[model samples]
Target: MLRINSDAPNFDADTTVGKINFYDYLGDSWGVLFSHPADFTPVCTTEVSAFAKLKPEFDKRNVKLIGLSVEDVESHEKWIQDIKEIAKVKNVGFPIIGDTFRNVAFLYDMVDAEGFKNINDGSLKTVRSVFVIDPKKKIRLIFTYPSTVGRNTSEVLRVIDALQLTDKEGVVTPINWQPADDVIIPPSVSNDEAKAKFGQFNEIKPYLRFTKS
Candidate 1:
């Protein structure tokens, strides 16, 4: 099992670009390690295309998306043509990892935790998993969704903004938070300190106040 701020399990594997170390590929950027269950699947096509189209936005923020699936590299290579043709994207430059032996998926526990142990029933395809790793190579957040759901890669962008802000400005986001929206003041700070640090804030309650970052 993984937790926030824990070191992301590192492994050397093949990606679309070429063979390279995971950390080397990440460089100084924040990394997004995501998984789609399989190649040539309907939902995987959409999300992969969407992520491809949104790569510029992610690039502007120093986030690199590394996609993964249980298929081999050749399958992933073939599937991208279908993906690009369907989505009408020029290219998907980001790396899509092929977990040929499910080693990386097992390393990340991206599949059913207990089921993998008891039995390898079915393909045991990796589920949709997302890991947000910071520049320091620490896991900042993780998300897992069953095969039935499509994901919002845009939401990954949102939380990365939040994480960067919180790290740099020492502020936190509130419910349904969007960029430029007011951030919350943690109770650890006193009202006077917050006033001094944050200038002005709206207090719904003494402990619950909102301030612009």
Candidate 2:
């Protein structure tokens, strides 16, 4: 398994999705690497379109999204064209890694080595996996789902919003959180500072939680 809080492994591949250098696409922004079992499947098709639909929001949050599968680059390209024509995902603009060699998938541990026969004809198939990497290249969030379940793209955006807030404002997001919601302010700041700046917040308990001051 790839180490957490470490830089993502670099990748270079030519696939139907297009030629891509992972680090290049990431380009100082946070990166979200999500993989599917393969291309042309029903669930994967809908899930990818979902991400494409929310591309603008991800861009607003300064996150670059990329997808991958064990399919050949040719297959990826054909499927992308098919998706555009059929799904009507006109501007489905994101690179998809061609993992025919399975190098990247193995590095991310998206495949189960023990389930060899079932995993990509003993080459390790790409299971559904998502990783959130920070600007510093450290991985901060990890999500793995069963192959049958499609990913929650909306939840991905919510998590990114939460991470960005914590990094910039030193706050935490609560459940059912929205952009305008009151964020949790850290208690380490002095009361004087809180009163001076964050006095509008509601305090639940000392050193516990404070919101919207």
Candidate 3:
């Protein structure tokens, strides 16, 4: 299984935009690689549209969104029209990958870990998986949800904000952290160092300190 801080797996696949080499396409940018079980499903439609609606927010933070599924490019192309119509978005410019061979899914460990499935239907289709990768190609966050549930795009964006802030400021987010909320000082930093870096901070407890992020 992929773990946080591990190198994100790279793949070459056909996408809505065209053929792409994953790493090359993600050069110098943060990326969100999310997967759905199949296309044309009701739940997946809303999830894709939600991501579409939040595209500009993601763009403002330099994060690229790419979606993947076990279907071919043709099916993805047709389904996106429905996604747009249902979500009431003008367009979905982000690329949706066609993992026809399930090669990418298997590489990312998106299938059942037990490895049992029927051939006729897409029983082996990928689970809903999200990978937040930084510009250095490190996997910063990973989330897996069942097909029955649609994900919250805003939460994903919130996580990206936390990751970027911590990466740049060397401070960690507190529980339920949001943008502009006070962040926590890592225990690794000395009190003096924290004072120098973040100025005066509130010491809720000996181990808990809060400072502006």
Candidate 4:
């Protein structure tokens, strides 16, 4: 399995937008590389439409959203028509990789327990895997949603806010943290340094301190 902070494995694949080198498409932007079970399924359709509608939200954060499925290219093309029709969207700007033989799935370890090589049968389908990668190509966040539930887009945006805030502000987040909420000061910074940085922070404990975002 892949670990957080590791490099996102790169590959070249055929996408709805045509052939693209993964890293090249990512460029200097943050990336959301996600997967569906397959194209044209009920839940998968809604999920893709949801992301399609929310593409601008991700774009605002300098994030590019790319989707994947175990299905082939032609099927993905047909399925996108349904996605646009259902979402009432004119276009799905993000690319969806057509992992015909499960090459990309295996490379990202997106297969479930019942997975087998090169087959698109039941149980071997790719799970809903979400990999949030940073501009430096480091894997920042990873999530695996069960087949039963679609992902919460707000939660995904929230975490991205938290990650970006932490990176820029050099502070960690507290439990159930939200953007603009108070953030936790890392213990690595001493009181004197904290004084220079945060100026006036709330010290709940010697190690637990809170400051404005």
Best by TM-score: 4
What is the per-residue lDDT of model 4 for residues 1-213, given as tens digits with 9 covering 90 to 100? 788999999999999999999999999999999888777778778888998999999999999999988777788999999999999999999999988777788888865332333354565444678999999999999998875777888998999999998998899997789887999889999999999999889999999999887
What is the clash tally of candidate 2? 6
Candidates in order have lDDT scores of 0.83, 0.75, 0.87, 0.87
The global Cα lDDT (0 to 1) of model 1 is 0.83
Lowest summed lDDT over 10 consecutive residues: which window, candidate 4?
112-121
Q: Write the per-residue lDDT of candidate 1 for residues 1-59, one digit (tens) a residue.
A: 77788899777988777786899999999999988767777887888889888889999
lDDT of 2 by residue, 42-131 (tens): 788887887777788888888988888776777788778766776677867788777775666777777544222224443433477789
TM-score of 1: 0.90
Clashing pairs in 3: none
lDDT of residue 158 for candidate 2: 84
What RMSD does model 4 have? 2.1
- Cα-based lDDT at residue 50, candidate 4: 93
Q: Looking at model 3, which ten-residue stretch has the lowest summed lDDT?
A: 111-120
> In model 4, where do residues sit more than 4 Å from their true spots?
112-120
TM-scores of the models, in the order given: 0.90, 0.85, 0.93, 0.94
